[PDB]
Structure formats: C-alpha cells, structure tokens
Paper text:
pmcThe BEN (BANP, E5R, and NAC1) domain is a ∼100-residue protein domain found in metazoans and viruses, but missing in nematodes and urochordates. There are nine BEN domain–containing transcription factors in the human genome, i.e., BANP, BEND2-7, and NAC1/2. The BEN domain-containing transcription factors regulate transcription by recruiting chromatin-modifying factors to specific chromatin regions via their DNA-binding BEN domains. Further structural analysis revealed that although all these BEN domains bind their target DNAs mainly through the insertion of the C-terminal α5 helix into the major groove of DNA, the residues of the α5 helices involved in the base interactions vary from one to another, explaining why they exhibit distinct DNA sequence preference.
To further investigate the role of cytosine methylation in BEN domain binding, we successfully obtained the structures of the BEND6 BEN domain in complexes with the CGCG motif and CGmCG motif containing DNAs, respectively. Structural analysis revealed that the BEND6 BEN domain adopted a canonical α-helical architecture but lacked the N-terminal β-hairpin compared to that of the BANP BEN domain. Like the BANP BEN domain as well as other reported BEN domains, the α5 helix of BEND6 inserted into the major groove of DNA, while a longer Loop 1 stepped into the minor groove of DNA, which together contributed to the electrostatic interactions with the DNA. In the BEND6-CGCG DNA structure, the side chain of K265 from the α5 helix formed two hydrogen bonds with the bases of G3′ and A4′, respectively, while the side chain of N261 from the α5 helix made hydrogen-bonding interactions with the base of G5′. The side chains of R254 from the α5 helix and S216, T218 from the Loop 1 formed four hydrogen bonds with the base of G7′. In addition, the side chain of S217 also made two hydrogen bonds with the base of G8. Moreover, the side chains of Q258, N261, and N262 formed water-mediated hydrogen bonds with the bases of C3 and C5, respectively. In addition to these base interactions, the side chains of K191, N194, T212, K225, R253, Q258, K259, and N262 formed several hydrogen bonds and salt bridges with the DNA backbone. Interestingly, the side chain of R254 adopted two conformations, one of which made interactions with the base and the other made interactions with the DNA backbone. The results showed that mutating R254, N261, and K265 to alanine individually reduced the binding of the BEND6 BEN domain with the CGCG DNA by ∼2-6-fold, suggesting that these residues played a role in DNA binding.
Residue numbers in the entry:
A (entry chain A), B (entry chain A): 174 to 265
Write the structure that this text describes.
DNA sequence: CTCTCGCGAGAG
DNA sequence: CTCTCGCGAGAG
C-alpha cells in the first residue's frame, strides 16, 4: 500500500486536519471509518462490550508520511490525533 | 496578570508540552490543576454530578501567548490541548 | 506525575 | 460530517 499523487491532488492543502479529512475520505468508506479506531484500543470510558478494531498500521504510517511532507511543521502525535478525529467525524 | 521572564526562564524550552508542564507548575498548585479544566465544560462521558470550574481565560491567553512566542510553529488549538493535558497530569 | 488515545455531548 | 475538549484506563 502506497498513496499516489492522484489521491493527494484531490485533498485540501491549507491545513493538516482538512488534508487528513479529505485523504481519509479518498482512501476509506464512511462505514469503515465509523467502525475502526487508529489503534484498536478499548476506551477508558466505554462500558460497551464491543471494541472497534485498528486501522492497518502500514496504512497509518503512509498517511502520516504523506501528511508530514505537506505539513512538515506538524508532529507525529498531532497527525495521529487528526486521523482519530477524522474517524470520529464518521461516527454520528 | 502577566507571565514574567523569570517564570519562563525556569521552563523546558525543547518541546511545547514540556514547556507548558513546567510553566503551569510554576504558576499553579497541583490541587488547583487537579480541580480545574481549561474551559469548565461538562464532559460528554462524566456521570459525576460535580463539574470542574474553568481556568481564568485571561491567564489561559497569557500562557498561549508566551508558548506561541517560544514555539511559533505550534497552533492555538494544540496549545489548548497541551494545557488540558497538564491539568490532567495532576488528577491521578 | 506523564503520554496516548477512544469516547461522546454539544455546538456548528 | 466537523471541531472542541473533559473524561480516564493503562502503560510508563
């Protein structure tokens, strides 16, 4: 798995969260994003038995890598929170 | 309320979260930080009746301003999450 | 204390 | 969908 320039070309480049939101929407379905978390961890505040499974970590790192080259002043942990925020955008 | 250089001089300058953690520890008690949130909002996941009151928003903005001048590549919303993380560091 | 990170209400 | 932001387990 490698993100291609034709996928990046279709994404907002003004702000990293806007870039991640578009790029994630290019790569993944709303249903996929609604039912996955970044890491597959159980939430400290979930009483629910069911836990969302993780994203593919190779895909995570490709997304971070592409984002880091467009937004080199953004750190790794910030981009990880941006991915999590986009997944959460798909859960209402 | 104005943060002075003698307060900033005592803080880690390598990373913004480390700078915020030190600066907050210079300004505030552990008990204060344990019992306040950034905004005073009720948590979506709190079943507790009791809600932590907000920080003084003039103090928040002075902290953000000092941080922004040391870490100009850090955005406003990131620094706000860093303040929240330091408050949370004092709650165990 | 410290960091990470899924939750989810509420406002848009 | 989107952002903000307090929670808090678990690992350090």
């Amino acid at each position: 798995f490698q993100i291609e320039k034709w996928q990046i070309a279709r994404c907002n480049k003004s702000k990293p969260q806007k870039f991640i939101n578009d790029l994630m929407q290019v790569l993944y379905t709303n249903e996929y994003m609604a039912t996955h978390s970044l890491t597959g961890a159980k939430s400290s505040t979930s009483r629910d038995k069911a836990v969302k499974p993780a994203m593919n970590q190779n895909e995570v790192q490709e997304i971070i890598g592409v984002t880091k080259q467009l937004f080199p002043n953004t750190d790794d942990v910030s981009i990880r929170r941006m991915i999590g925020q986009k997944l959460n955008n798909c859960t209402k």
